[PDB]
Design an enzyme around this catalytic site. Structure first.
Site, PDB file in Angstrom:
ATOM      1  N   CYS A 154       3.346  -6.756   4.438  1.00 40.63           N
ATOM      2  CA  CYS A 154       1.968  -7.484   4.505  1.00 40.63           C
ATOM      3  C   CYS A 154       1.328  -7.349   5.890  1.00 40.63           C
ATOM      4  O   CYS A 154       1.780  -8.077   6.727  1.00 40.63           O
ATOM      5  CB  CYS A 154       1.755  -8.687   3.927  1.00 40.63           C
ATOM      6  SG  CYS A 154       0.106  -9.256   3.981  1.00 40.63           S
ATOM      7  N   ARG A 174      -0.594 -11.197   7.523  1.00 38.68           N
ATOM      8  CA  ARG A 174      -0.308 -12.269   7.406  1.00 38.68           C
ATOM      9  C   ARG A 174      -0.600 -13.250   8.574  1.00 38.68           C
ATOM     10  O   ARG A 174      -0.125 -14.359   8.513  1.00 38.68           O
ATOM     11  CB  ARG A 174       1.308 -11.989   7.489  1.00 38.68           C
ATOM     12  CG  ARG A 174       2.168 -11.485   6.449  1.00 38.68           C
ATOM     13  CD  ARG A 174       3.571 -11.217   6.386  1.00 38.68           C
ATOM     14  NE  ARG A 174       3.832 -10.224   7.163  1.00 38.68           N
ATOM     15  CZ  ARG A 174       4.953  -9.696   7.663  1.00 38.68           C
ATOM     16  NH1 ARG A 174       5.991 -10.597   8.005  1.00 38.68           N
ATOM     17  NH2 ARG A 174       5.449  -8.627   8.306  1.00 38.68           N
ATOM     18  N   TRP A 210      -8.187 -10.698   0.530  1.00 35.95           N
ATOM     19  CA  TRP A 210      -9.332  -9.806   0.240  1.00 35.95           C
ATOM     20  C   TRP A 210      -8.946  -8.486   0.598  1.00 35.95           C
ATOM     21  O   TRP A 210      -7.340  -8.284   0.811  1.00 35.95           O
ATOM     22  CB  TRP A 210     -10.586  -9.900   1.327  1.00 35.95           C
ATOM     23  CG  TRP A 210      -9.851 -10.219   2.819  1.00 35.95           C
ATOM     24  CD1 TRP A 210      -9.497  -9.149   3.681  1.00 35.95           C
ATOM     25  CD2 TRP A 210      -9.592 -11.549   3.258  1.00 35.95           C
ATOM     26  NE1 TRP A 210      -9.099  -9.981   4.948  1.00 35.95           N
ATOM     27  CE2 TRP A 210      -9.079 -11.132   4.606  1.00 35.95           C
ATOM     28  CE3 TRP A 210     -10.139 -12.871   3.090  1.00 35.95           C
ATOM     29  CZ2 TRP A 210      -9.017 -12.084   5.859  1.00 35.95           C
ATOM     30  CZ3 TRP A 210      -9.595 -13.815   4.104  1.00 35.95           C
ATOM     31  CH2 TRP A 210      -9.334 -13.440   5.392  1.00 35.95           C
ATOM     32  N   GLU A 263      -7.052   0.389   1.035  1.00 35.74           N
ATOM     33  CA  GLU A 263      -6.219   0.285  -0.488  1.00 35.74           C
ATOM     34  C   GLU A 263      -7.235   0.903  -1.649  1.00 35.74           C
ATOM     35  O   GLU A 263      -6.831   1.303  -2.593  1.00 35.74           O
ATOM     36  CB  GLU A 263      -6.166  -1.116  -0.846  1.00 35.74           C
ATOM     37  CG  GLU A 263      -5.097  -1.820   0.282  1.00 35.74           C
ATOM     38  CD  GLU A 263      -4.980  -3.284  -0.071  1.00 35.74           C
ATOM     39  OE1 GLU A 263      -3.942  -3.531  -1.068  1.00 35.74           O
ATOM     40  OE2 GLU A 263      -5.646  -4.311   0.423  1.00 35.74           O
TER      41      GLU A 263
HETATM   42  C1  HEM Z   1      -5.974 -12.225   3.385  1.00 33.25           C
HETATM   43  C2  HEM Z   1      -5.982 -10.485   3.044  1.00 33.25           C
HETATM   44  C3  HEM Z   1      -4.761  -9.795   2.533  1.00 33.25           C
HETATM   45  C4  HEM Z   1      -4.827  -8.658   3.006  1.00 33.25           C
HETATM   46  C5  HEM Z   1      -5.949  -7.647   3.653  1.00 33.25           C
HETATM   47  C6  HEM Z   1      -3.492  -7.946   2.733  1.00 33.25           C
HETATM   48  C7  HEM Z   1      -3.261  -6.604   3.019  1.00 33.25           C
HETATM   49  C8  HEM Z   1      -1.970  -6.211   2.399  1.00 33.25           C
HETATM   50  C9  HEM Z   1      -1.760  -4.684   2.209  1.00 33.25           C
HETATM   51  C10 HEM Z   1      -2.735  -3.801   2.571  1.00 33.25           C
HETATM   52  C11 HEM Z   1      -0.639  -4.462   1.651  1.00 33.25           C
HETATM   53  C12 HEM Z   1      -0.143  -3.207   1.339  1.00 33.25           C
HETATM   54  C13 HEM Z   1      -0.026  -2.941  -0.265  1.00 33.25           C
HETATM   55  C14 HEM Z   1      -0.500  -1.329  -0.405  1.00 33.25           C
HETATM   56  O1  HEM Z   1      -0.518  -0.568   0.707  1.00 33.25           O
HETATM   57  O2  HEM Z   1      -0.673  -0.919  -1.663  1.00 33.25           O
HETATM   58  C15 HEM Z   1       0.078  -5.962   1.349  1.00 33.25           C
HETATM   59  C16 HEM Z   1       1.071  -6.110   0.783  1.00 33.25           C
HETATM   60  C17 HEM Z   1       1.543  -7.384   0.431  1.00 33.25           C
HETATM   61  N1  HEM Z   1       0.724  -8.878   0.660  1.00 33.25           N
HETATM   62 FE1  HEM Z   1      -0.940  -8.941   1.926  1.00 33.25          FE
HETATM   63  N2  HEM Z   1      -2.789  -9.006   2.459  1.00 33.25           N
HETATM   64  C18 HEM Z   1      -3.443 -10.155   2.137  1.00 33.25           C
HETATM   65  C19 HEM Z   1      -3.149 -11.338   1.735  1.00 33.25           C
HETATM   66  C20 HEM Z   1      -1.913 -11.722   1.028  1.00 33.25           C
HETATM   67  C21 HEM Z   1      -1.548 -12.915   0.383  1.00 33.25           C
HETATM   68  C22 HEM Z   1      -2.366 -14.006   0.329  1.00 33.25           C
HETATM   69  C23 HEM Z   1      -0.470 -12.833  -0.092  1.00 33.25           C
HETATM   70  C24 HEM Z   1       0.481 -13.850  -0.666  1.00 33.25           C
HETATM   71  C25 HEM Z   1       0.350 -15.175  -0.595  1.00 33.25           C
HETATM   72  C26 HEM Z   1       0.167 -11.444   0.343  1.00 33.25           C
HETATM   73  C27 HEM Z   1       1.159 -10.974   0.041  1.00 33.25           C
HETATM   74  C28 HEM Z   1       1.646  -9.569   0.147  1.00 33.25           C
HETATM   75  C29 HEM Z   1       2.698  -8.924  -0.521  1.00 33.25           C
HETATM   76  C30 HEM Z   1       3.847  -9.752  -1.134  1.00 33.25           C
HETATM   77  C31 HEM Z   1       2.797  -7.661  -0.323  1.00 33.25           C
HETATM   78  C32 HEM Z   1       3.760  -6.597  -0.856  1.00 33.25           C
HETATM   79  C33 HEM Z   1       3.623  -6.258  -2.067  1.00 33.25           C
HETATM   80  C34 HEM Z   1       4.575  -5.083  -2.761  1.00 33.25           C
HETATM   81  O3  HEM Z   1       5.618  -4.969  -2.389  1.00 33.25           O
HETATM   82  O4  HEM Z   1       4.256  -4.406  -3.434  1.00 33.25           O
HETATM   83  N3  HEM Z   1      -1.071 -10.744   0.968  1.00 33.25           N
HETATM   84  N4  HEM Z   1      -1.138  -6.976   1.912  1.00 33.25           N
HETATM   85  N1  V4Y Z   2       5.995   5.505  -1.345  1.00 36.41           N
HETATM   86  C1  V4Y Z   2       5.505   4.667  -0.549  1.00 36.41           C
HETATM   87  C2  V4Y Z   2       5.557   4.491   0.706  1.00 36.41           C
HETATM   88  C3  V4Y Z   2       5.081   3.628   1.701  1.00 36.41           C
HETATM   89  C4  V4Y Z   2       4.145   2.846   1.292  1.00 36.41           C
HETATM   90  C5  V4Y Z   2       3.627   2.890  -0.172  1.00 36.41           C
HETATM   91  C6  V4Y Z   2       2.286   1.928  -0.286  1.00 36.41           C
HETATM   92  C7  V4Y Z   2       2.159   1.614  -1.768  1.00 36.41           C
HETATM   93  C8  V4Y Z   2       0.697   1.537  -2.532  1.00 36.41           C
HETATM   94  N2  V4Y Z   2       0.536   1.960  -3.672  1.00 36.41           N
HETATM   95  C9  V4Y Z   2      -0.343   1.167  -4.419  1.00 36.41           C
HETATM   96  C10 V4Y Z   2       0.390   0.046  -4.654  1.00 36.41           C
HETATM   97  C11 V4Y Z   2       1.449  -0.043  -5.740  1.00 36.41           C
HETATM   98  C12 V4Y Z   2       2.081  -1.341  -5.982  1.00 36.41           C
HETATM   99  C13 V4Y Z   2       1.466  -2.452  -5.559  1.00 36.41           C
HETATM  100  C14 V4Y Z   2       0.429  -2.534  -4.848  1.00 36.41           C
HETATM  101  O1  V4Y Z   2      -0.328  -3.661  -4.197  1.00 36.41           O
HETATM  102  C15 V4Y Z   2       0.818  -4.477  -3.436  1.00 36.41           C
HETATM  103  C16 V4Y Z   2      -0.166  -5.871  -2.994  1.00 36.41           C
HETATM  104  C17 V4Y Z   2       0.383  -7.039  -2.927  1.00 36.41           C
HETATM  105  C18 V4Y Z   2      -0.403  -8.045  -2.278  1.00 36.41           C
HETATM  106  C19 V4Y Z   2      -1.664  -7.844  -1.825  1.00 36.41           C
HETATM  107  C20 V4Y Z   2      -2.571  -8.902  -1.147  1.00 36.41           C
HETATM  108  C21 V4Y Z   2      -3.771  -8.607  -0.551  1.00 36.41           C
HETATM  109  C22 V4Y Z   2      -4.185  -7.062  -0.480  1.00 36.41           C
HETATM  110  N3  V4Y Z   2      -5.503  -6.856   0.220  1.00 36.41           N
HETATM  111  N4  V4Y Z   2      -3.427  -6.113  -1.071  1.00 36.41           N
HETATM  112  C23 V4Y Z   2      -2.110  -6.425  -1.758  1.00 36.41           C
HETATM  113  C24 V4Y Z   2      -1.348  -5.398  -2.320  1.00 36.41           C
HETATM  114  C25 V4Y Z   2      -0.230  -1.220  -4.283  1.00 36.41           C
HETATM  115  N5  V4Y Z   2       4.360   3.532  -0.763  1.00 36.41           N
HETATM  116 CL    CL Z   3      -5.266  -2.669  -5.643  1.00 27.46          CL
END
Ligand code: HEM
Ligand code: V4Y
Ligand code: CL
Length: 362
Positions: free
Chosen positions: A65, A68, A237, A242
């Site tokens: 993330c 953070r 947000w 994304e």
């Molecule tokens: C406040 C705005 C936030 C932004 C802009 C943000 C941004 C992101 C982004 C871009 C990812 C990558 C997912 C992807 O590329 O598909 C991510 C992953 C993650 N975020 Fe954040 N995030 C935010 C808030 C939070 C919050 C509030 C939590 C939990 C309390 C959180 C927990 C995580 C977790 C657990 C992942 C990894 C999920 C996975 O393995 O699929 N995030 N975040």
């Molecule tokens: N092979 C690979 C290699 C590197 C990176 C990736 C990126 C995966 C993105 N593929 C779409 C996707 C799949 C599964 C879960 C997803 O969401 C996770 C998440 C969790 C919390 C969030 C909190 C805020 C925020 N703004 N976004 C969040 C996104 C996304 N793939």
């Molecule tokens: Cl999404």
């Protein structure tokens, strides 16, 4: 077995949680009350303070993330008192409304009763609380392909989608002791959506793209001191990539780059024209523009990485190891224009944390 791992994680968690809260003196007695509770009952119950700080630590430890920096301002809603489907449903409805906050999105988590011992009290089937349905029949594709299996699960239980490309899936969850989940249509009044327009290219609206305002991830497990909150939906947000670089662009999602190329007036015929890269940029500009126009919170990937640098600096200043997943921290648009790309990150897993868990459907 079981009971000793729990006690082990409890000590590690209470020690660190109380240090950070400046309550190190109370660790001995609190571990001594947890002492007995795990003996007599097999488990222990977090204080509201421990649960709130535990959820904040779990976000801070989420290697993938980029957002953070704001871990400590997470709005934690304690819903461990829920016992009925109507109460789960209303708490999920409440989460949407208060996280959305008229567009000024509040990072929020709603925490439901933790699993008993392996036994879930509440089992949420949605991946996000707001998501679009996906269909495939006769080789016509409609909606969001990533939602096909859940959409088909939902239609087995008597839900029926209108088969637009943006059908809102119902909330769907199962209670302990029920064999099947229930589902509830989302009240539309609760769901903000943003039409995608372009700042400069009036025809971009011909694409009739939209996305929803708030990503509320509802299928991850929160682990805090050995307690397994399998149901604890949370949201931030969006970071604009994304939506613009993945949800709307990926060939296996909405796959819109060739239509974007056409409306922005460039040919999609030669790799060397870099038309996909250009369409990616214009679509991602449109997404940020549109969310900003409507007054819905969003962050671009440059500002996000700038905030994440401050998170890194804050970690060092606080004496905390930084952990991170470089492959997920870099943005999918111009990654080398961020500081993230140019450094390395220890991908070690620290707890509290959010974890993947098996889908209840298939
Ligand atoms: C406040 C705005 C936030 C932004 C802009 C943000 C941004 C992101 C982004 C871009 C990812 C990558 C997912 C992807 O590329 O598909 C991510 C992953 C993650 N975020 Fe954040 N995030 C935010 C808030 C939070 C919050 C509030 C939590 C939990 C309390 C959180 C927990 C995580 C977790 C657990 C992942 C990894 C999920 C996975 O393995 O699929 N995030 N975040
Ligand atoms: N092979 C690979 C290699 C590197 C990176 C990736 C990126 C995966 C993105 N593929 C779409 C996707 C799949 C599964 C879960 C997803 O969401 C996770 C998440 C969790 C919390 C969030 C909190 C805020 C925020 N703004 N976004 C969040 C996104 C996304 N793939
Ligand atoms: Cl999404």
């Amino acid at each position: 077995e079981e009971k000793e791992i729990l006690w082990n994680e409890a000590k590690a968690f209470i020690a660190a949680c109380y240090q950070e809260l400046g309550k190190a003196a109370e660790v001995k007695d609190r571990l001594a009350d947890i002492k007995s509770e795990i003996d007599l009952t097999g488990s222990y119950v977090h204080t509201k303070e421990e649960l709130e700080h535990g959820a904040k630590m779990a976000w801070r430890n989420s290697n993938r993330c980029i957002g953070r920096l704001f871990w400590n301002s997470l709005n934690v809603i304690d819903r461990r008192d829920v016992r009925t489907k109507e109460e789960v449903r209303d708490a999920l409805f409440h989460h949407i409304e208060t996280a959305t906050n008229n567009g000024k999105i509040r990072p929020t988590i709603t925490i439901f009763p933790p699993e008993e011992k392996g036994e879930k009290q509440v089992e949420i089937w949605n991946h996000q609380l707001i998501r679009y349905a996906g269909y495939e029949s006769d080789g016509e594709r409609i909606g969001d392909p990533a939602s096909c299996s859940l959409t088909a699960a939902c239609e087995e239980l008597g839900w029926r989608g209108e088969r637009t490309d943006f059908d809102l899936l119902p909330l769907i969850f199962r209670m302990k002791g029920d064999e099947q989940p229930v589902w509830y249509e989302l009240p539309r009044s609760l769901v903000i959506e943003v039409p995608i327009t372009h700042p400069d290219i009036e025809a971009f609206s011909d694409l009739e793209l939209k996305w929803y305002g708030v990503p509320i991830i509802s299928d991850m497990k929160l682990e805090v001191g050995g307690i397994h909150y399998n149901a604890a939906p949370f949201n931030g947000w969006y970071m604009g990539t994304e939506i613009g670089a993945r949800n709307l662009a990926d060939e296996k999602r909405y796959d819109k780059l060739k239509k974007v190329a056409s409306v922005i007036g460039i040919a999609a015929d030669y790799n060397t024209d870099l038309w996909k890269d250009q369409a990616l940029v214009e679509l991602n500009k449109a997404v940020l523009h549109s969310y900003k126009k409507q007054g819905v919170s969003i962050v671009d990937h440059h500002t996000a990485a700038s905030q994440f640098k401050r998170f890194e600096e804050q970690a060092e200043e606080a004496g905390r190891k930084l952990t991170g997943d470089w492959t997920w921290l870099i943005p999918p648009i111009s990654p080398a224009a961020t500081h993230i790309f140019h450094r390395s990150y220890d991908n070690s897993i620290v707890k509290p944390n959010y974890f993947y868990q098996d889908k209840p459907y298939e």
